[PDB]
Structure 1
Amino acid sequence: SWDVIKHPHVTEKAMNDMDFQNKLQFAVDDRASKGEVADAVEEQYDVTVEQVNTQNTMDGEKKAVVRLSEDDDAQEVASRI
């Protein structure tokens, strides 16, 4: 059975979405839907997902841009990992 989240996507652009928009980015399995990515995240880091945006990258894997609720602080979550 495949897992949804593969690893955080840390790049200058990812850092901004985190600082300025409370969004975290991950490399996910390309069979995962936005909904499956949202649930996966809330359970892995215990946070609330407001919105998810996905893109099928030219690297072969799927990238997801998860925006957290104003109740959580992206930077903080990203920091522990």
Structure 2
Amino acid sequence: SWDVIKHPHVTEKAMNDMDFQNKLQFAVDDRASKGEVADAVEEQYDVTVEQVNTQNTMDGEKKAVVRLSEDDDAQEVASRI
């Protein structure tokens, strides 16, 4: 059985979304929907997801831009992992 979250996408553009827009970027499974990516992030990190934006990358994988709520800080979630 396949897992939803593969690993975090950590690049410079991923950090600009983390420091400024409270968004965490993940490389997810391509069969996973926006709603499934939302649930899995909440169930793994104990955060509240507001919006998920996906893209099927030229690497064969799916990249997900996950926005957290104002109660949660993206920088603090990325530092523990």
After TM superposition, the runs of 4+ consecutive aligned structure 1 residues lying more than 3 A away are none
C-alpha separation in 2, matches of 1:34 and 1:78: 20
**Cα displacement (A) at 1:52:** 0.2
Aligned residues: 81
* Cα distance in 2 between the residues matched to 1:21 and 1:48: 15
CA deviation vs aligned residue, 1:36-69 (integer Å, no higher than 9, x gap): 0000000000000000000000000000000000
Query: What is the percent sequence identity of the aligned residues?
Result: 100
CA RMSD between the two structures = 0.2
Q: How does the TM-score come out when normalised to structure 1?
A: 0.99
Once residues 7 and 56 of structure 2 are traced to their aligned partners in structure 1, the CA distance between those partners, rounded to angstroms, is 15
SS class of match (1:21): coil
Kindly state the Cα deviation for residue 3 of structure 1 after the two structures are TM-superposed: 0.3
Q: TM-score by structure 2 length?
A: 0.99
SS in structure 1 at match of 2:20:
helix
Q: Take 1:71 and 1:61, find their aligned partners in 2: how far apart are those partners?
A: 30
- Gaps (5+ residues) in structure 2? none
Residues 6-39 of structure 1: CA deviation (Å, up to 9, x unaligned): 0000000000100000000000000000000000
Cα distance in 1 for partners of 2:50, 2:21 equals 12
Question: Which runs of 5 or more structure 1 residues have no equivalent in the other structure?
Answer: none
